[PDB]
Protein backbone atom coordinates (compact mmCIF):
# COMPACT_ATOMS: atom_id res chain seq x y z
CA UNK A 1 0.00 0.00 0.00
CA UNK A 2 1.53 3.72 -0.69
CA UNK A 3 0.55 5.85 1.88
CA UNK A 4 0.25 9.27 1.14
CA UNK A 5 2.26 11.76 3.16
CA UNK A 6 -0.50 13.23 5.72
CA UNK A 7 -1.74 9.46 5.86
CA UNK A 8 1.00 8.45 6.77
CA UNK A 9 1.97 11.01 9.59
CA UNK A 10 -0.97 10.66 11.30
CA UNK A 11 -0.65 6.70 11.49
CA UNK A 12 2.93 7.56 12.84
CA UNK A 13 1.80 10.10 14.97
CA UNK A 14 -1.09 7.81 16.57
CA UNK A 15 1.75 4.82 17.17
CA UNK A 16 3.27 7.00 18.90
CA UNK A 17 6.50 8.23 16.76
CA UNK A 18 5.59 12.33 17.30
CA UNK A 19 8.52 13.50 19.15
CA UNK A 20 9.75 9.89 20.38
CA UNK A 21 13.50 9.71 21.82
CA UNK A 22 13.12 13.62 20.19
CA UNK A 23 12.48 13.01 17.21
CA UNK A 24 10.22 15.16 15.51
CA UNK A 25 7.44 13.38 13.35
CA UNK A 26 8.72 14.91 9.98
CA UNK A 27 12.22 12.62 10.65
CA UNK A 28 9.75 9.44 10.46
CA UNK A 29 7.79 10.63 7.76
CA UNK A 30 11.06 11.31 5.52
CA UNK A 31 12.83 8.39 6.44
CA UNK A 32 9.84 6.20 4.93
CA UNK A 33 9.58 8.45 1.65
CA UNK A 34 13.43 7.95 0.95
CA UNK A 35 13.70 4.18 2.66
CA UNK A 36 10.07 2.77 1.04
CA UNK A 37 8.78 5.23 -0.64
CA UNK A 38 5.92 5.00 1.72
CA UNK A 39 5.58 1.67 0.41
CA UNK A 40 4.36 -1.10 2.95
CA UNK A 41 5.18 -3.63 0.92
CA UNK A 42 8.54 -2.18 -0.20
CA UNK A 43 12.08 -4.70 -0.47
CA UNK A 44 15.55 -4.51 -1.06
CA UNK A 45 17.84 -7.06 -1.09
CA UNK A 46 21.34 -5.69 -0.26
CA UNK A 47 25.01 -6.76 -1.52
CA UNK A 48 25.06 -9.02 1.51
CA UNK A 49 22.54 -11.17 2.26
CA UNK A 50 19.95 -9.26 4.14
CA UNK A 51 16.94 -7.71 2.94
CA UNK A 52 15.22 -4.72 4.23
CA UNK A 53 11.60 -4.91 4.85
CA UNK A 54 8.32 -2.30 4.55
CA UNK A 55 7.89 1.35 5.29
CA UNK A 56 10.36 1.58 7.55
CA UNK A 57 12.91 -0.92 5.88
CA UNK A 58 13.65 -3.26 8.56
CA UNK A 59 16.80 -5.37 8.28
CA UNK A 60 16.66 -9.22 8.51
CA UNK A 61 20.36 -9.49 9.94
CA UNK A 62 19.65 -7.52 12.65
CA UNK A 63 16.09 -6.83 13.57
CA UNK A 64 13.75 -8.85 12.05
CA UNK A 65 13.79 -12.87 10.82
CA UNK A 66 13.21 -13.95 6.96
CA UNK A 67 15.02 -17.34 7.85
CA UNK A 68 17.36 -16.98 4.89
CA UNK A 69 19.80 -14.24 6.59
CA UNK A 70 23.18 -15.24 7.57
CA UNK A 71 24.01 -13.95 11.18
CA UNK A 72 20.83 -13.14 11.85
CA UNK A 73 20.08 -11.67 15.08
CA UNK A 74 16.36 -10.78 14.97
CA UNK A 75 16.69 -8.03 17.80
CA UNK A 76 13.14 -6.88 16.87
CA UNK A 77 11.91 -10.86 18.03
CA UNK A 78 9.92 -10.70 14.62
CA UNK A 79 9.59 -12.53 11.54
CA UNK A 80 9.90 -10.21 8.38
CA UNK A 81 7.02 -10.76 6.45
CA UNK A 82 5.10 -9.54 9.57
CA UNK A 83 6.44 -6.11 8.57
CA UNK A 84 5.11 -5.96 4.82
CA UNK A 85 1.45 -4.79 6.02
CA UNK A 86 -1.45 -1.80 5.05
CA UNK A 87 -1.23 -1.31 9.60
CA UNK A 88 2.15 0.34 10.07
CA UNK A 89 2.04 -1.09 14.13
CA UNK A 90 5.05 -3.96 13.66
CA UNK A 91 7.19 -1.68 12.04
CA UNK A 92 6.80 1.05 14.16
CA UNK A 93 7.15 -1.42 17.28
CA UNK A 94 10.37 -2.38 15.78
CA UNK A 95 11.28 1.13 14.76
CA UNK A 96 11.08 1.46 18.17
CA UNK A 97 13.53 -1.07 19.40
CA UNK A 98 15.48 0.14 16.92
CA UNK A 99 15.66 3.85 17.98
CA UNK A 100 16.95 3.65 21.92
CA UNK A 101 18.59 7.13 21.93
CA UNK A 102 19.03 10.48 20.45
CA UNK A 103 20.92 9.55 17.62
CA UNK A 104 18.97 6.17 16.65
CA UNK A 105 17.52 7.85 13.64
CA UNK A 106 20.79 7.20 12.08
CA UNK A 107 19.55 3.38 11.98
CA UNK A 108 18.38 4.45 8.42
CA UNK A 109 20.99 5.71 5.73
CA UNK A 110 18.54 7.05 3.76
CA UNK A 111 17.30 9.18 6.84
CA UNK A 112 21.44 10.41 8.02
CA UNK A 113 21.78 11.21 4.22
CA UNK A 114 18.79 12.40 2.90
CA UNK A 115 16.29 13.78 5.64
CA UNK A 116 19.49 15.13 8.31
CA UNK A 117 20.00 18.61 7.97
CA UNK A 118 16.67 19.24 6.22
CA UNK A 119 13.20 21.05 6.87
CA UNK A 120 11.46 17.16 7.88
CA UNK A 121 8.59 18.96 9.43
CA UNK A 122 7.82 20.38 5.31
CA UNK A 123 6.65 16.84 4.93
CA UNK A 124 3.75 16.89 7.69
CA UNK A 125 2.73 20.90 7.44
CA UNK A 126 -0.88 21.08 5.83
CA UNK A 127 -1.56 18.02 7.61
CA UNK A 128 -4.61 17.20 9.58
CA UNK A 129 -2.93 15.59 13.02
CA UNK B 1 31.84 19.27 22.25
CA UNK B 2 29.59 21.37 20.07
CA UNK B 3 30.70 24.66 20.04
CA UNK B 4 29.77 28.16 18.16
CA UNK B 5 31.13 30.98 18.26
CA UNK B 6 30.74 34.80 16.30
CA UNK B 7 33.12 37.29 14.86
CA UNK B 8 32.59 40.21 13.77
CA UNK B 9 33.50 44.06 12.82
CA UNK B 10 32.66 45.57 16.34
CA UNK B 11 31.68 48.90 15.07
CA UNK B 12 30.50 49.30 11.40
CA UNK B 13 29.75 52.56 9.02
CA UNK B 14 25.75 53.02 8.23
CA UNK B 15 27.49 54.23 5.04
CA UNK B 16 28.71 50.57 4.64
CA UNK B 17 27.83 46.45 5.32
CA UNK B 18 28.13 44.31 7.68
CA UNK B 19 30.08 40.64 7.68
CA UNK B 20 29.49 38.09 10.71
CA UNK B 21 31.58 34.83 11.11
CA UNK B 22 30.33 31.87 13.22
CA UNK B 23 32.88 28.93 13.54
CA UNK B 24 31.00 26.01 14.54
CA UNK B 25 32.69 22.72 16.27
CA UNK B 26 31.72 19.59 17.59
CA UNK B 27 29.14 18.83 14.44
CA UNK B 28 29.12 18.69 10.77
CA UNK B 29 27.18 21.74 9.23
CA UNK B 30 25.54 19.52 6.49
CA UNK B 31 23.58 18.26 9.45
CA UNK B 32 22.37 20.85 11.59
CA UNK B 33 20.69 24.11 10.63
CA UNK B 34 21.78 27.40 12.41
CA UNK B 35 19.63 30.02 13.03
CA UNK B 36 21.22 34.07 13.54
CA UNK B 37 19.49 35.65 16.38
CA UNK B 38 19.79 39.11 17.64
CA UNK B 39 19.68 41.12 20.88
CA UNK B 40 19.50 44.69 21.14
CA UNK B 41 21.13 46.04 24.86
CA UNK B 42 18.40 45.60 27.25
CA UNK B 43 16.24 44.06 24.67
CA UNK B 44 14.51 40.98 23.44
CA UNK B 45 15.97 38.25 21.25
CA UNK B 46 14.70 39.36 17.24
CA UNK B 47 15.14 36.22 14.78
CA UNK B 48 16.92 37.03 11.87
CA UNK B 49 17.52 33.68 10.17
CA UNK B 50 18.60 30.82 8.98
CA UNK B 51 20.76 28.40 6.92
CA UNK B 52 20.11 24.13 6.86
CA UNK B 53 22.04 21.59 7.01
CA UNK B 54 21.21 21.21 3.57
CA UNK B 55 21.67 24.87 2.44
CA UNK B 56 18.44 26.26 2.02
CA UNK B 57 18.22 29.59 3.73
CA UNK B 58 14.81 31.21 5.54
CA UNK B 59 15.24 35.16 6.60
CA UNK B 60 12.88 37.63 8.85
CA UNK B 61 10.62 38.92 6.40
CA UNK B 62 11.36 42.63 7.37
CA UNK B 63 14.89 42.41 7.08
CA UNK B 64 14.83 39.94 4.02
CA UNK B 65 16.39 42.48 1.81
CA UNK B 66 19.28 43.55 3.81
CA UNK B 67 20.05 39.59 5.22
CA UNK B 68 22.36 37.37 3.16
CA UNK B 69 23.15 34.12 5.25
CA UNK B 70 25.79 31.19 3.81
CA UNK B 71 27.81 28.83 4.88
CA UNK B 72 30.96 26.88 3.62
CA UNK B 73 30.56 23.29 5.25
CA UNK B 74 34.23 22.20 4.96
CA UNK B 75 35.52 25.25 7.11
CA UNK B 76 32.56 24.95 9.42
CA UNK B 77 31.93 28.24 9.65
CA UNK B 78 28.45 30.21 8.98
CA UNK B 79 28.22 33.77 7.77
CA UNK B 80 25.65 36.70 8.04
CA UNK B 81 25.80 39.83 5.64
CA UNK B 82 23.42 42.69 5.96
CA UNK B 83 23.80 45.97 4.47
CA UNK B 84 21.88 49.35 4.95
CA UNK B 85 23.01 49.33 8.04
CA UNK B 86 20.81 51.52 10.62
CA UNK B 87 21.52 52.86 14.25
CA UNK B 88 18.83 50.19 14.71
CA UNK B 89 21.06 47.59 14.18
CA UNK B 90 22.76 48.10 17.13
CA UNK B 91 22.64 44.59 19.26
CA UNK B 92 24.50 41.72 20.16
CA UNK B 93 24.08 38.88 17.07
CA UNK B 94 24.31 35.42 17.93
CA UNK B 95 24.77 32.08 16.23
CA UNK B 96 23.15 28.87 17.63
CA UNK B 97 22.91 25.43 15.94
CA UNK B 98 18.87 23.90 15.63
CA UNK B 99 19.44 20.41 16.86
CA UNK B 100 15.53 19.28 15.04
CA UNK B 101 13.17 22.37 16.29
CA UNK B 102 15.37 23.63 18.67
CA UNK B 103 18.42 26.09 19.34
CA UNK B 104 20.42 23.61 21.70
CA UNK B 105 23.99 25.38 21.19
CA UNK B 106 24.24 28.96 21.06
CA UNK B 107 27.47 30.82 20.66
CA UNK B 108 28.45 33.66 23.19
CA UNK B 109 27.69 36.29 20.65
CA UNK B 110 29.04 39.60 18.99
CA UNK B 111 28.55 43.20 19.50
CA UNK B 112 27.94 45.12 16.64
CA UNK B 113 27.54 48.71 17.20
CA UNK B 114 26.35 51.25 14.02
CA UNK B 115 28.31 54.78 14.48
CA UNK B 116 27.63 57.64 11.72
CA UNK C 1 4.07 35.88 9.64
CA UNK C 2 3.30 34.02 13.22
CA UNK C 3 3.65 36.23 16.04
CA UNK C 4 4.18 35.53 20.28
CA UNK C 5 2.60 37.44 22.53
CA UNK C 6 4.45 36.52 26.05
CA UNK C 7 2.85 37.64 29.25
CA UNK C 8 3.68 38.92 31.35
CA UNK C 9 6.89 41.20 30.64
CA UNK C 10 7.81 41.09 34.79
CA UNK C 11 7.73 38.91 37.21
CA UNK C 12 8.37 39.53 40.89
CA UNK C 13 8.57 36.38 43.01
CA UNK C 14 10.23 34.63 46.08
CA UNK C 15 12.29 31.30 46.34
CA UNK C 16 9.97 28.44 46.90
CA UNK C 17 7.01 30.16 44.55
CA UNK C 18 5.32 28.75 41.53
CA UNK C 19 5.08 30.98 38.87
CA UNK C 20 3.41 30.68 34.89
CA UNK C 21 4.45 32.41 31.86
CA UNK C 22 2.43 32.30 29.01
CA UNK C 23 2.79 32.77 25.30
CA UNK C 24 -0.03 32.68 22.46
CA UNK C 25 0.32 32.32 18.93
CA UNK C 26 -1.38 34.71 16.57
CA UNK C 27 -1.84 31.09 14.32
CA UNK C 28 -1.41 27.68 15.03
CA UNK C 29 2.28 26.47 15.70
CA UNK C 30 0.85 22.91 16.02
CA UNK C 31 3.32 22.39 19.68
CA UNK C 32 6.90 23.35 17.87
CA UNK C 33 7.34 26.08 21.01
CA UNK C 34 10.71 26.11 22.97
CA UNK C 35 11.52 28.07 25.55
CA UNK C 36 15.02 29.56 26.38
CA UNK C 37 16.47 30.99 29.75
CA UNK C 38 18.65 33.91 29.79
CA UNK C 39 20.86 35.27 32.79
CA UNK C 40 22.18 38.60 32.85
CA UNK C 41 25.07 38.69 30.33
CA UNK C 42 24.81 35.41 28.92
CA UNK C 43 23.59 33.40 26.13
CA UNK C 44 19.82 32.43 25.89
CA UNK C 45 19.95 28.56 26.94
CA UNK C 46 17.41 25.84 25.96
CA UNK C 47 15.30 25.04 28.74
CA UNK C 48 12.06 22.73 27.21
CA UNK C 49 11.32 22.01 23.48
CA UNK C 50 8.65 20.76 21.38
CA UNK C 51 6.01 21.98 24.22
CA UNK C 52 6.59 19.65 26.74
CA UNK C 53 10.11 18.21 26.43
CA UNK C 54 12.58 19.26 29.08
CA UNK C 55 16.04 19.75 27.75
CA UNK C 56 19.24 17.44 29.22
CA UNK C 57 20.12 18.75 32.84
CA UNK C 58 16.54 21.02 33.19
CA UNK C 59 15.35 20.70 36.67
CA UNK C 60 12.01 19.35 36.86
CA UNK C 61 10.23 21.93 38.71
CA UNK C 62 10.08 23.29 35.09
CA UNK C 63 7.46 22.35 33.17
CA UNK C 64 6.21 23.57 29.38
CA UNK C 65 2.00 22.70 28.06
CA UNK C 66 0.22 23.85 25.35
CA UNK C 67 -1.44 23.23 21.94
CA UNK C 68 -2.51 25.00 19.33
CA UNK C 69 -2.27 28.56 19.91
CA UNK C 70 -1.51 28.75 23.67
CA UNK C 71 1.41 27.44 25.65
CA UNK C 72 2.91 27.99 29.15
CA UNK C 73 5.73 28.14 30.95
CA UNK C 74 5.57 26.91 34.71
CA UNK C 75 8.55 26.91 37.22
CA UNK C 76 7.02 25.18 40.32
CA UNK C 77 8.83 26.30 43.48
CA UNK C 78 11.63 28.26 41.94
CA UNK C 79 14.92 28.60 43.01
CA UNK C 80 17.94 31.11 43.25
CA UNK C 81 19.31 30.12 39.25
CA UNK C 82 15.99 30.43 38.16
CA UNK C 83 15.86 34.16 38.31
CA UNK C 84 16.60 36.12 34.98
CA UNK C 85 14.90 36.19 31.40
CA UNK C 86 12.51 33.59 29.39
CA UNK C 87 11.55 33.62 25.64
CA UNK C 88 9.35 31.00 23.94
CA UNK C 89 10.37 30.54 20.49
CA UNK C 90 7.96 28.71 17.43
CA UNK C 91 9.28 26.76 14.80
CA UNK C 92 6.27 26.41 13.05
CA UNK C 93 7.44 27.09 8.90
CA UNK C 94 9.67 30.20 8.89
CA UNK C 95 10.10 32.85 9.80
CA UNK C 96 10.65 31.88 13.19
CA UNK C 97 9.62 34.46 15.96
CA UNK C 98 10.46 34.82 19.97
CA UNK C 99 7.70 36.11 22.32
CA UNK C 100 8.36 39.55 23.71
CA UNK C 101 10.34 37.77 26.90
CA UNK C 102 9.83 38.29 31.11
CA UNK C 103 11.80 39.08 33.82
CA UNK C 104 11.73 36.73 36.40
CA UNK C 105 12.78 38.86 39.58
CA UNK C 106 13.30 38.26 43.12
CA UNK C 107 10.83 39.94 44.98
Known amino acids: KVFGRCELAAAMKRHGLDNYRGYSLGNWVCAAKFESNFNTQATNRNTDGSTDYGILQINSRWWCNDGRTPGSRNLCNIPCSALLSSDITASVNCAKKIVSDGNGMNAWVAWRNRCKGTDVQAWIRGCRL | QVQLQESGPGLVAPSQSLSITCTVS????????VNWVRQPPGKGLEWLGM???????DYNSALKSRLSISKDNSKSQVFLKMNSLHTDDTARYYC??????????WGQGTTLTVSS | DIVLTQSPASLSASVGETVTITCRAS??????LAWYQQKQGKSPQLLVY???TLADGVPSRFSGSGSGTQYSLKINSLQPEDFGSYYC?????????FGGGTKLEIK
Open chain 3, 50 to 52: YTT
Open chain 2, 96 to 105: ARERDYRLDY
Open chain 2, 26 to 33: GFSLTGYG
Open chain 2, 51 to 57: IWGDGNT
Open chain 3, 89 to 97: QHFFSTPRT
Open chain 3, 27 to 32: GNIHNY
